[PDB]
């Protein structure tokens, strides 16, 4: 019936002044735009059809044509920025926001989806959707005692659209927008649908990606324990944004980092052996921002047995993960006590550390040499530089620190030098 029309035929029927004729052409349009292979987005734009689709959104007494046009505009806006811009320039934003009030759940769902595709283009379209007043009627759709009485697919669409309103920096979303969305967002973060949880953690991870005062708005709402719970999900599409959000919060103040520790987060990090390389990476990254904190927080790292896990990740891991581990160690050795640094050496940090001095990356080597000297400072404070110096010797670390005098980078070669003449003379 409406299967593969030409864009010429669609134009003829939409330009008829026959609402039923237009309904059929609009659906032929939607079917074109929703095929797997190369939907003709540009052909439809160039045919001039976008303003007619937007106008069809208003046709209250023909909800089928509202539905078809909304579907069609959704898919045009799912494309390139210029394609999405074509939909906005057609006046679709006030029109989709009106549709949020539809009595038909499949219409409003399609309205939700398109606003998501528009807000996803970036900060300006995001902010522009908010300025047109999308938030109030979006949250209204979720004003029910129990989310569980809403349709599954309907719920996941809203959550996704709500994360895109939380997304992108330069600038971050309006603060009042964030405060208006955050409570409902906390409610989705406790819903039991795996896809809703994933999309909510993404949103929370965006909101915590920025200045400490952004992080503070999230921590203030008490979401951290539930982030820690989701940090231990079996479902890796959940673990991934939960970890990113946790990693974001610990870049804040020590008090904010302390609330991650207080919620039990360190118990899940034995993350550091996850089969998925990026989880291992982001977990080590988080660990380096926790060893950068206070001595009592370093001590909490020690007490959870996490130091043997950093030795492990230093010994064998993807090299990007190892580079974070070297950062974690240098931070630990910068802020830790003598006892804590001594503990590090007893756990076997020395050998895996020396072997990465063979790396090409210049920052990892200056980070590693940094760590060594903090560790030699501790050995002096104990009258014990000698024994450590021999450990570095026996496993062939001296060879490395020697050869690092040849290094082109200036901070490198003066670093190794200082080490050899101060403790290897």
């Amino acid at each position: 019936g409406t299967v593969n029309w030409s864009v010429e035929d669609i134009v003829k029927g939409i330009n008829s002044n026959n609402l039923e004729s237009q309904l059929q052409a609009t659906q032929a349009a939607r079917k074109l735009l929703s095929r797997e292979k190369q939907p003709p987005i540009d052909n439809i734009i160039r045919a001039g059809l976008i303003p007619k689709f937007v106008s069809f959104l208003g046709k209250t007494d023909c909800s089928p044509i509202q539905f078809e046009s909304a579907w069609a505009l959704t898919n045009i806006a799912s494309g390139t920025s210029e394609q999405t811009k074509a939909v906005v320039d057609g006046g679709a934003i006030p029109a989709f926001i009106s549709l949020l009030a539809s009595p038909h759940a499949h219409i409003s769902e399609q309205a939700v989806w398109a606003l998501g595709n528009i807000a996803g283009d970036g900060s300006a379209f995001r902010d522009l959707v908010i300025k047109h007043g999308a938030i109030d009627p979006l949250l209204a759709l979720l004003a029910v005692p129990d989310l569980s009485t809403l349709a599954c697919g309907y719920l996941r669409n809203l959550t996704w659209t709500l994360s895109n309103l939380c997304r992108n920096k330069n600038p971050a979303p309006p603060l009042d927008a964030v405060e208006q969305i955050l409570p409902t967002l906390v409610r989705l973060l406790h819903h039991n649908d795996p896809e809703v949880l994933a999309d909510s953690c993404w949103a929370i991870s965006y909101l915590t990606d920025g200045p400490n005062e952004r992080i503070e708005m999230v921590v203030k709402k008490g979401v951290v324990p539930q982030l820690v719970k989701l940090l231990g999900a079996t479902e890796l599409p959940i673990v991934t944004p939960a970890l990113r959000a946790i990693g974001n919060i610990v870049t804040g103040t020590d008090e904010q980092t302390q609330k991650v520790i207080d919620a039990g987060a360190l118990a899940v990090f034995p993350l550091l052996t996850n089969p998925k390389t990026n989880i291992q990476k982001e977990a080590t990254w988080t660990m380096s921002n926790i060893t950068a904190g206070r001595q009592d927080q370093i001590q909490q790292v020690v007490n959870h047995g996490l130091v043997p896990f950093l030795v492990g990740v230093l010994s064998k891991a993807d090299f990007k993960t190892q580079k974070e581990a070297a950062w974690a160690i240098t931070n630990y050795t910068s802020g830790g006590t003598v006892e804590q640094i001594v503990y590090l050496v007893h756990c076997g940090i020395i050998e895996p550390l020396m072997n990465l001095l063979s790396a090409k990356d210049t920052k990892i080597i200056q980070v590693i040499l940094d760590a060594i000297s903090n560790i030699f400072q501790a050995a002096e404070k104990l009258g014990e530089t000698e024994k450590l110096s021999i450990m570095i010797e026996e496993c062939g670390g001296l060879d490395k620190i020697e050869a690092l005098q040849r290094h082109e980078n200036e901070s490198v070669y003066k670093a190794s030098l200082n080490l050899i003449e101060k403790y290897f003379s």
Partner: peptide, 9 residues
């Protein structure tokens, strides 16, 4: 997180 999404129903 997907940035935009095309519907295929």
């Amino acid at each position: 997180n997907y940035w935009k999404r095309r519907i295929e129903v």
